[PDB]
Design an enzyme around this catalytic site. Structure first.
Site, PDB file in Angstrom:
ATOM      1  N   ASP A 136       0.415   4.850   5.222  1.00 14.09           N
ATOM      2  CA  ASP A 136      -0.747   4.099   5.682  1.00 14.09           C
ATOM      3  C   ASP A 136      -0.323   2.939   6.579  1.00 14.09           C
ATOM      4  O   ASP A 136      -0.801   2.807   7.707  1.00 14.09           O
ATOM      5  CB  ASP A 136      -1.545   3.571   4.489  1.00 14.09           C
ATOM      6  CG  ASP A 136      -2.542   4.587   3.965  1.00 14.09           C
ATOM      7  OD1 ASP A 136      -3.170   5.281   4.790  1.00 14.09           O
ATOM      8  OD2 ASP A 136      -2.693   4.687   2.729  1.00 14.09           O
ATOM      9  N   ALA A 167       0.825  -1.202   0.000  1.00 12.86           N
ATOM     10  CA  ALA A 167       0.000   0.000   0.000  1.00 12.86           C
ATOM     11  C   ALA A 167       0.862   1.257   0.000  1.00 12.86           C
ATOM     12  O   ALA A 167       1.065   1.883  -1.041  1.00 12.86           O
ATOM     13  CB  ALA A 167      -0.935  -0.003   1.201  1.00 12.86           C
ATOM     14  N   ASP A 168       1.366   1.622   1.174  1.00 11.54           N
ATOM     15  CA  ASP A 168       2.208   2.806   1.310  1.00 11.54           C
ATOM     16  C   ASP A 168       2.618   3.018   2.763  1.00 11.54           C
ATOM     17  O   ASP A 168       1.811   2.984   3.691  1.00 11.54           O
ATOM     18  CB  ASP A 168       1.474   4.042   0.789  1.00 11.54           C
ATOM     19  CG  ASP A 168       0.060   4.147   1.329  1.00 11.54           C
ATOM     20  OD1 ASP A 168      -0.786   3.318   0.936  1.00 11.54           O
ATOM     21  OD2 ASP A 168      -0.198   5.057   2.145  1.00 11.54           O
ATOM     22  N   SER A 169       3.925   3.244   2.985  1.00  7.57           N
ATOM     23  CA  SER A 169       4.561   3.468   4.302  1.00  7.57           C
ATOM     24  C   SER A 169       3.702   4.335   5.238  1.00  7.57           C
ATOM     25  O   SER A 169       3.534   4.040   6.421  1.00  7.57           O
ATOM     26  CB  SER A 169       5.934   4.107   4.035  1.00  7.57           C
ATOM     27  OG  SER A 169       5.793   5.412   3.471  1.00  7.57           O
TER      28      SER A 169
END
Length: 79
Positions: free
Chosen positions: A39, A35-37
């Site tokens: 989040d 997803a992303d660091s």
């Protein structure tokens, strides 16, 4: 389902949404879907912020796996 799923579904649901049907792969939380660091670290910061543990960066390699996750909350929180 298992254990950590409770807080895991609460942190992911409050952070972005309910992706339990597209996140629970027993692979990774930052690799499987990547997803992303922001989040990932976010929802995680809450999990520990509510459990009151001593987690920091290990959470990025302790919850990634459904197995390590349940073992991370049972070994630390033990509840």
């Amino acid at each position: 389902l298992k254990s950590t799923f409770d807080d895991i579904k609460k942190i992911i649901s409050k952070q972005l949404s309910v992706e339990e049907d597209k996140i629970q792969m027993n692979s990774n939380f930052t690799k499987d879907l990547g997803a992303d660091s922001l989040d990932l670290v976010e929802l995680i910061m809450a999990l520990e912020e509510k459990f009151n543990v001593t987690i920091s960066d290990q959470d990025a390699l302790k919850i990634n796996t459904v197995q390590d996750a349940i073992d991370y909350i049972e070994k630390n929180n033990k509840q």
